[PDB]
């Protein structure tokens, strides 16, 4: 199937308290592989997966240089955004950046991304054509003119279609055993009476990889969202993921309800009934 590489960085200003904090992480698919934290002692891009530790010193040095430089650019960018939004030097603000590419089974480029958020909201993003920008507001419009003038799009385009895809292909081969594995969900049901009149049914999916999964309740064959509750998909902490979906159900009516589980590790969807 297809794969993705992503870098996520967060920069957080701390007035009075000195320089902003900057944290970046990299993932292939749903597997983290590097981190950088401006607050920590090392001051290096660090490995967070086994299959990356094999990269040579040139790699660690290049990646360290690139990520430190970005921390400084985004520290200045916070300063600039203050001015654009006429905001005071008193409060804390956040700048977030996402970057990366998707590739198909053949390893060919599918899609690239480069986007920013200020204070948790879209600021500027590269459009899917990788030739133009979306600016979310008037401030972002000022950045968009600058980036147009300086040909930022053509630079990032070349990188996403080249360096990013070539990089993704290398990582997928080095981490083949980890990354090109699919683990299907192990599933079960739980049942708890809430009263004389009602019961909760909880449909579980455990130990699955990648994180993408769908859990849906039906009653008598019909999709149901009334009286249902679905938690966010969550890391087990060992490389796999968990999720559950519950419904509140009249006592003795359990058998009418079915949970349906879709995941790419499954040749056909599973149904569960109490």
């Amino acid at each position: 199937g297809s794969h993705s590489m992503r870098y996520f960085s967060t920069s957080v200003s701390r007035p009075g308290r000195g320089e902003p904090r900057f944290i970046a992480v990299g993932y292939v698919d749903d597997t983290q592989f590097v981190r950088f934290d401006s607050d920590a002692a090392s001051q290096r891009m660090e490995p967070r997966a086994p299959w990356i530790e094999q990269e040579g010193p040139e790699y660690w040095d290049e990646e360290t240089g690139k990520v430190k430089a970005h921390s400084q650019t985004d520290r200045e960018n916070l300063r600039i955004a203050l001015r654009y939004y006429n905001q005071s030097e008193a409060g804390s603000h956040t700048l977030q950046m996402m970057f990366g590419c998707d590739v198909g089974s053949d390893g060919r480029f599918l899609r690239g991304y480069h986007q920013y958020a200020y204070d948790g909201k879209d600021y500027i993003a590269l459009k899917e054509d990788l030739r133009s920008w979306t600016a979310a507001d008037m401030a972002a419009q000022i950045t968009k003119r600058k980036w147009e003038a300086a040909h930022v799009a053509e630079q990032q385009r070349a990188y996403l279609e080249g360096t990013c895809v070539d990089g993704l292909r290398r990582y997928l081969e080095n981490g083949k055993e980890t990354l090109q594995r699919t683990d299907p969900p192990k599933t079960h049901m739980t049942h708890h009476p809430i009263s004389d009149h009602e019961a909760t049914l909880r449909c579980w999916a455990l130990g699955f990889y990648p994180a993408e999964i769908t859990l849906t309740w039906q009653r008598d064959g019909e999709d149901q969202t009334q009286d249902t509750e679905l938690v966010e998909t969550r890391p087990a902490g060992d490389g796999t993921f968990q999720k559950w979906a519950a419904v509140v159900v009249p006592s003795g009516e359990e058998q009418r309800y079915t949970c349906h589980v879709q995941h790419e590790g499954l040749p056909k969807p599973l149904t569960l009934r109490w």
């Binding site: 870098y7 970046a24 990299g26 590097v34 891009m45 990646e63 690139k66 990520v67 430089a69 970005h70 650019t73 985004d74 200045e76 960018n77 600039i80 955004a81 654009y84 970057f99 480069h114 000022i142 950045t143 600058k146 980036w147 300086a150 930022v152 630079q155 990032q156 990188y159 360096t163 990013c164 990089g167």
Partner: peptide
């Protein structure tokens, strides 16, 4: 490979 971010000035 982390991006080249020199030109990303707001």
């Amino acid at each position: 490979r982390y991006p080249l971010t020199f030109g990303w000035c707001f």
